[PDB]
Enzyme design. Sequence first.
Site, mmCIF file in Angstrom:
data_model
loop_
_atom_site.group_PDB
_atom_site.id
_atom_site.type_symbol
_atom_site.label_atom_id
_atom_site.label_comp_id
_atom_site.label_asym_id
_atom_site.label_seq_id
_atom_site.Cartn_x
_atom_site.Cartn_y
_atom_site.Cartn_z
ATOM 1 C CG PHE A 1 -1.784 1.304 1.496
ATOM 2 C CD1 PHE A 1 -2.924 1.339 0.439
ATOM 3 C CD2 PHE A 1 -1.615 2.062 2.342
ATOM 4 C CE1 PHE A 1 -3.679 2.352 0.675
ATOM 5 C CE2 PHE A 1 -2.444 3.432 2.534
ATOM 6 C CZ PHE A 1 -3.392 3.349 1.476
ATOM 7 C CG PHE B 1 -3.648 -2.730 -2.175
ATOM 8 C CD1 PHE B 1 -2.795 -3.107 -1.122
ATOM 9 C CD2 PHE B 1 -4.197 -4.227 -2.969
ATOM 10 C CE1 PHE B 1 -2.487 -4.312 -0.826
ATOM 11 C CE2 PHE B 1 -3.910 -5.313 -2.332
ATOM 12 C CZ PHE B 1 -3.130 -5.517 -1.277
ATOM 13 C CD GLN C 1 -10.742 -9.824 0.486
ATOM 14 O OE1 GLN C 1 -11.647 -9.034 -0.175
ATOM 15 N NE2 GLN C 1 -9.771 -10.135 -0.139
ATOM 16 C CG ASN D 1 -16.052 -4.098 12.475
ATOM 17 O OD1 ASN D 1 -17.032 -4.328 11.860
ATOM 18 N ND2 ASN D 1 -15.080 -3.172 12.036
ATOM 19 C CG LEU E 1 -19.133 -4.354 20.653
ATOM 20 C CD1 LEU E 1 -19.925 -4.233 21.958
ATOM 21 C CD2 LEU E 1 -20.041 -4.523 19.417
ATOM 22 N N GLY E 2 -15.445 -1.136 19.148
ATOM 23 C CA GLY E 2 -14.735 0.017 19.325
ATOM 24 C C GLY E 2 -14.662 0.350 20.723
ATOM 25 N N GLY F 1 -15.802 -1.862 23.749
ATOM 26 C CA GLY F 1 -15.557 -3.053 23.976
ATOM 27 C C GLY F 1 -15.869 -4.364 23.045
ATOM 28 C CG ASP G 1 -5.032 -7.306 12.001
ATOM 29 O OD1 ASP G 1 -5.897 -7.744 11.642
ATOM 30 O OD2 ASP G 1 -4.249 -6.426 11.267
HETATM 31 N N1 LIG Z 1 -10.974 3.990 21.647
HETATM 32 C C1 LIG Z 1 -10.686 2.892 22.214
HETATM 33 N N2 LIG Z 1 -10.137 2.647 23.409
HETATM 34 C C2 LIG Z 1 -9.678 1.649 23.990
HETATM 35 N N3 LIG Z 1 -9.876 0.368 23.433
HETATM 36 C C3 LIG Z 1 -10.436 0.280 21.943
HETATM 37 C C4 LIG Z 1 -10.844 1.487 21.297
HETATM 38 N N4 LIG Z 1 -11.259 1.385 20.316
HETATM 39 C C5 LIG Z 1 -11.154 -0.023 19.866
HETATM 40 N N5 LIG Z 1 -10.442 -0.660 21.296
HETATM 41 C C6 LIG Z 1 -10.363 -2.032 21.258
HETATM 42 O O1 LIG Z 1 -10.104 -2.594 20.045
HETATM 43 C C7 LIG Z 1 -11.014 -3.494 19.880
HETATM 44 C C8 LIG Z 1 -11.262 -3.595 18.424
HETATM 45 O O2 LIG Z 1 -11.631 -2.193 17.821
HETATM 46 P P1 LIG Z 1 -12.497 -1.999 16.325
HETATM 47 O O3 LIG Z 1 -12.650 -0.577 16.155
HETATM 48 O O4 LIG Z 1 -13.960 -2.563 17.068
HETATM 49 O O5 LIG Z 1 -11.788 -2.913 15.402
HETATM 50 P P2 LIG Z 1 -11.938 -2.575 14.104
HETATM 51 O O6 LIG Z 1 -12.959 -1.902 13.497
HETATM 52 O O7 LIG Z 1 -11.465 -4.147 13.477
HETATM 53 O O8 LIG Z 1 -10.305 -1.855 13.917
HETATM 54 P P3 LIG Z 1 -9.221 -1.535 12.699
HETATM 55 O O9 LIG Z 1 -9.964 -1.339 11.505
HETATM 56 O O10 LIG Z 1 -8.537 -2.956 12.927
HETATM 57 S S1 LIG Z 1 -8.265 0.014 13.493
HETATM 58 C C9 LIG Z 1 -12.054 -3.300 20.643
HETATM 59 O O11 LIG Z 1 -12.998 -4.577 20.772
HETATM 60 C C10 LIG Z 1 -11.642 -2.780 22.008
HETATM 61 O O12 LIG Z 1 -11.070 -3.740 22.780
#
Ligand SMILES: Nc1ncnc2c1ncn2[C@@H]1O[C@H](COP(=O)(O)OP(=O)(O)OP(O)(O)=S)[C@@H](O)[C@H]1O
Lengths: 323, 323
Positions: free
Chosen positions: A102, A116, A173, A195, A224-225, A228, A257
């Site tokens: 990338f 990409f 994907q 997610n 859930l970002g 949790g 990941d």
């Molecule tokens: N703002 C935050 N503070 C603390 N922990 C977080 C936060 N955002 C995410 N996490 C942790 O990261 C996990 C995964 O985050 P998500 O945002 O749901 O993953 P995702 O959408 O696959 O993120 P990417 O695309 O890999 S950055 C959550 O279940 C939390 O345990």
Amino acid sequence: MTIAVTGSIATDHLMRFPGRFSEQLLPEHLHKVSLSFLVDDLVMHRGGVAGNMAFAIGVLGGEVALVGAAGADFADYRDWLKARGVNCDHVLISETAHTARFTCTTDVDMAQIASFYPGAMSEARNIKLADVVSAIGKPELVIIGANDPEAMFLHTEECRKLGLAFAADPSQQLARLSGEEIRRLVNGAAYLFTNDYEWDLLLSKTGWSEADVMAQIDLRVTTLGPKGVDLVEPDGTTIHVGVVPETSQTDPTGVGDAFRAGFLTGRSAGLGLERSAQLGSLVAVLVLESTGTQEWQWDYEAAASRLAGAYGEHAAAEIVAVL
Amino acid sequence: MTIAVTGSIATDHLMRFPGRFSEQLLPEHLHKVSLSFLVDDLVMHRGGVAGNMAFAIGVLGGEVALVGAAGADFADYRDWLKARGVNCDHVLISETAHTARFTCTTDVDMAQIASFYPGAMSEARNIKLADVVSAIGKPELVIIGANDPEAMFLHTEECRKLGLAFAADPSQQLARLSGEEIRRLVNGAAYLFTNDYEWDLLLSKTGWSEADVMAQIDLRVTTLGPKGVDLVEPDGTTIHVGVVPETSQTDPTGVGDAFRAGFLTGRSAGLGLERSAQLGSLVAVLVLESTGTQEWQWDYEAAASRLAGAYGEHAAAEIVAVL
Ligand SMILES: Nc1ncnc2c1ncn2[C@@H]1O[C@H](COP(=O)(O)OP(=O)(O)OP(O)(O)=S)[C@@H](O)[C@H]1O
Ligand SMILES: Nc1ncnc2c1ncn2[C@@H]1O[C@H](COP(=O)(O)OP(=O)(O)OP(O)(O)=S)[C@@H](O)[C@H]1O
Ligand code: NA
Ligand code: NA
């Protein structure tokens, strides 16, 4: 104890333009542009979902094999991963193609121009998991990460044939696969990771109900970002675990990941569902707070302390007892 | 016998987009674009004017030292050059910056989006030619190639102080330098190399007449594309040599560098002006006919044959007698 991680292996090459792309985008030349940007920074990050996950499992001391396709330019990345205990014997090295890449240039207004290059990733369809089994025996778990799509199908099918537990981890994907293709990646999984946006996308594209999915898998893990993670079993048990509070959000890349790595490392080390999600949540926040995806450090003392703040001393002690 | 080659060290990373950039360049988003191109080819070429020249001198069997600034990512390029006899001991390796890089994506309509990252090149101003002299003695010639501009001045000034013969070879920096700066690069040169557009640019920016320039240098070498090369001495002698006819023009990149290498290799090996220009013309056509700048082969038998076709058996024999 060995987790085999399949999926993409890639690097990100990020360049900064101190000017504005818009200054070169007047209507007179849009039909055949010749843009030239003098950039003043280049940052390279090691990545790919499988590389990220394998790196994390290795750093945490788990037994892990990286199984994906890369180019000859993978050598320094191999040494990096090998230094953290990752078995890279089953990384297929292309004779002709470079490692997936990338490339992104960003200007002062945060406009971006990105490409990409799949490169060697496309050759992951030629990897046989049987060759892994012959060298190391049956992995305890095979992660089916985002990859060459044909490779995702072939790996999942090989897992079923060979009696290997697998985690369906399609992530980005999902948007590109058909409803039938998604069903084919999910049937029989030991774990489904997504997610919450992707969970809803999965149900709508497949036409499955939640009950139908849970009849197919042993555990749903839905991140859930900042809210949790939900873990749902086919008997109707649900566990929700909150995050470890962050002190910055320097780069959200690689967080999913990292969560997966920490969680699965916990499971392989014998932790329960709650504790494994707590461990995954710590690794996730360490990646959130650091540039790139593999540029974080692992500090046993700081981990214990941070886990205790989020989840209490008892839980923290149970978790670090296995690291 | 040692030629020290100063100038840029870089790689070119070339990517092909099978689509059209214009499809993503509608007016609605020009203020803050987010372009994404799935590319289907990535080619990497080793380059920089000093790398090109050093590679060529090495392949031809000359004694050559590469003197420029690069990054840790220079290692495989070092091994490549060392395999051809190039002394890379005096390549300054940055602790923080990557090797200079040109990146270009081209679409099906031959529109291009390009960036240049100077990286470690900027650190060439920290190289001291005295350190070269301490290790290998006084070079017979120092080439002042296109580089970090401050480094060009500092190297030229150091040559005069240390009594080292130098070739002024500013090429594409002529457009960027002031008339005074150009004079400062040219005074006292053993050789001035340019193409014919650059020769005219040099005279107009400096305000020099041709006679004024020839009062400053020992030899003017002016390349003329398919019309060959003019060599002019301060006594009024002029020599014109025609090209070696090409059989294709697969890639014109690196042709000037190749000419210079072949010519100077000939001079260092004791050839006269005509014969050295004939040798330079052969190396130039080999680079014209090959992809990139260092992707050509050196075949003694084919060189003799091709030289004889262009210049006669006698001249060909005189030239290969020194290779
Ligand atoms: N703002 C935050 N503070 C603390 N922990 C977080 C936060 N955002 C995410 N996490 C942790 O990261 C996990 C995964 O985050 P998500 O945002 O749901 O993953 P995702 O959408 O696959 O993120 P990417 O695309 O890999 S950055 C959550 O279940 C939390 O345990
Ligand atoms: N079409 C051609 N056929 C054969 N020889 C050529 C041709 N074009 C160039 N040469 C040889 O290459 C030398 C240098 O070419 P020029 O085009 O004058 O150099 P330049 O403008 O510095 O080229 P670049 O920018 O390095 S591709 C000439 O003096 C010839 O010996
Ligand atoms: Na990050
Ligand atoms: Na070429």
